[PDB]
Design a binder for this molecule. Structure first.
Ligand SMILES: Cc1cc(-n2nccn2)cc(C(=O)NNS(=O)(=O)c2ccccc2)c1F
Ligand code: NA
Ligand SMILES: [Zn+2]
Length: 268
């Protein structure tokens, strides 16, 4: 038997995928997780006891973004191994393709939290290779189900690219993306490129956004905004065409914006 259900904070969440918690934890009807330190437990009574003991009220690591009650913590996999392993086991319940859970030292993790009087409540995260040979600015990205489709994933996507900008690099998420991940990246890419075209070569879009040229091209193709001329993709759009796409109901929900002013982060 696998873990099929978790209790975290005030949520109960059904699993989507196998995650390799120890055998004796899977056998339980439900796993209970401290929303702050991510310790996983077998019983409600040990969970209730931990809640009265645990002194964490937010992720470890450094708070590298705070605007109002939205917060991002940077956590080095080498400085906080247990926490990051628990995070990976949690994430694997909702990620089909994640394969790495216990070798966390090559990764840094960016934890998104929503804050209230009681603490910084975990919403999702993305991991990132400290050294990405293939130029990936995201390794795995996960939003817990009760927060999906609510602007948090778009926030984390925009956040990964702001880091890429500060590093003077382009980056792409490591593939394969989940189904929701695909739609989310395509929608974010479209929003960003359509906004830049409203107020430019493909290379300039890539340098202004840190989106790779391939991701730009494939998005402009899906928008039918590129011409081909002698082996070269070339942007072919009328400012009115841009505006028509932006008025569509795709880009109608007001984002949680990433305010670069509130991002306290220098490149490694
Ligand atoms: C990359 C990603 C991954 C996952 N994910 N994969 C496995 C578990 N969770 C969920 C989300 C999400 O929640 N997307 N919805 S959105 O923020 O409202 C959104 C609106 C417009 C554009 C982009 C996003 C996501 F963006
Ligand atoms: Na659920
Ligand atoms: Zn705890």
């Amino acid at each position: 038997k696998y873990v099929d259900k978790i209790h975290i904070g005030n949520y109960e969440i059904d699993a989507w995928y196998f995650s390799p918690f120890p055998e004796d934890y899977g056998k339980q009807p439900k796993l209970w997780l401290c929303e702050y330190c991510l310790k996983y437990m077998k019983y409600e009574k040990s969970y209730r006891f931990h809640l009265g003991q645990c002194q964490w009220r937010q992720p470890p690591g450094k708070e590298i973004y705070r605007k109002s009650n939205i917060s991002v913590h940077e956590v080095d996999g080498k400085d906080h191994k247990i926490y990051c392993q628990n995070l990976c086991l949690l994430a694997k319940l909702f990620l089909d393709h994640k394969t790495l859970y216990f070798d966390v030292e090559p990764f840094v993790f960016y934890i998104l939290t929503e804050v209230d009087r009681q603490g910084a409540h975990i919403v999702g995260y993305f991991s990132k290779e400290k050294e990405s040979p293939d130029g990936n600015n995201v390794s795995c990205i996960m939003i817990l189900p009760p927060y999906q489709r609510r602007g948090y994933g778009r926030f984390l996507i925009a956040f990964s690219y702001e880091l890429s900008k500060l590093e003077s690099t382009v980056g792409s998420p490591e593939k394969p993306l989940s189904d929701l991940g695909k739609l989310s990246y395509r929608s974010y890419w479209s929003s960003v490129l359509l906004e830049n075209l409203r107020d430019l070569s493909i290379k300039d879009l890539s340098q202004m956004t840190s989106i790779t040229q391939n991701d730009i091209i494939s998005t402009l193709q899906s928008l039918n905004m590129v011409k081909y001329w002698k082996g070269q993709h070339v942007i072919c759009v009328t400012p009115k065409l841009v505006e028509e796409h932006l008025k569509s109901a795709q880009y109608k929900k007001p984002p949680i914006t990433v305010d670069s002013v509130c991002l306290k982060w220098a490149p490694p």
